[PDB]
Design a protein around this ligand. Sequence first.
Ligand code: 595
Ligand code: CL
Ligand code: CL
Ligand code: CL
Lengths: 99, 99
Amino acid sequence: PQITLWQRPLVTIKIGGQLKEALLDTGADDTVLEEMNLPGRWKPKMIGGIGGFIKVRQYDQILIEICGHKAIGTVLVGPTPVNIIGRNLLTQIGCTLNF
Amino acid sequence: PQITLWQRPLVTIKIGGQLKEALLDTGADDTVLEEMNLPGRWKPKMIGGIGGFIKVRQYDQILIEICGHKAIGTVLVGPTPVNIIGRNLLTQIGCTLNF
Ligand SMILES: COC(=O)N[C@H](C(=O)N[C@@H](C)CCC[C@@H](C=O)N(CCC(C)C)S(=O)(=O)c1ccc(N)cc1)C(c1ccccc1)c1ccccc1
Ligand SMILES: [Cl-]
Ligand SMILES: [Cl-]
Ligand SMILES: [Cl-]
């Protein structure tokens, strides 16, 4: 699809068999989701935001479907204001910016 | 142009007679620039997200040139770790997400 930016570019994602709403975020290097259960082990990660840095849990090789496109990659879990799909998965789904 | 997301989508902007590098950020509601001077009236504002909130100065009706496309809009100025072009100005240059 082609998504304009007059409103937040919110899409439905599917992860662990559940639907969530998430923001397609070209400013985010990484995908970060609100607290949830994910399978497997996690590793520590620090990410920097507008307000400073936070600690998050890093899960690798996680299956996630984004606006109907399947991806398998790194998902960080922690105290984010909204679920955010970052460049690590935007590239998997073939997303570009155009003007 | 078509800008891929393999790397941060950084472009050159011109604002207040200064050339700067800024991030095209579909996740950002607002445009936020590192500390700089701008003409005219401003009011304080808090903007938030990952990490928490920061206080910024809000300047309205500011001329900006983004990757050679002229726009006008609100520019926030404050302690952001990176110059961000948000949706308020992305729309004006006709920027879309495509996949
Ligand atoms: C008054 O209105 C607001 O304050 N709106 C919020 C908003 O747009 N804020 C933007 C001006 C500023 C944050 C834009 C945002 C993404 O690239 N970031 C900046 C880019 C990095 C590289 C510096 S960020 O918050 O630091 C970030 C960093 C890393 C990662 N993985 C994800 C996000 C907005 C938000 C949108 C997206 C991410 C974080 C916050 C928000 C939503 C819900 C509740 C509170 C605030
Ligand atoms: Cl990944
Ligand atoms: Cl505006
Ligand atoms: Cl349009």
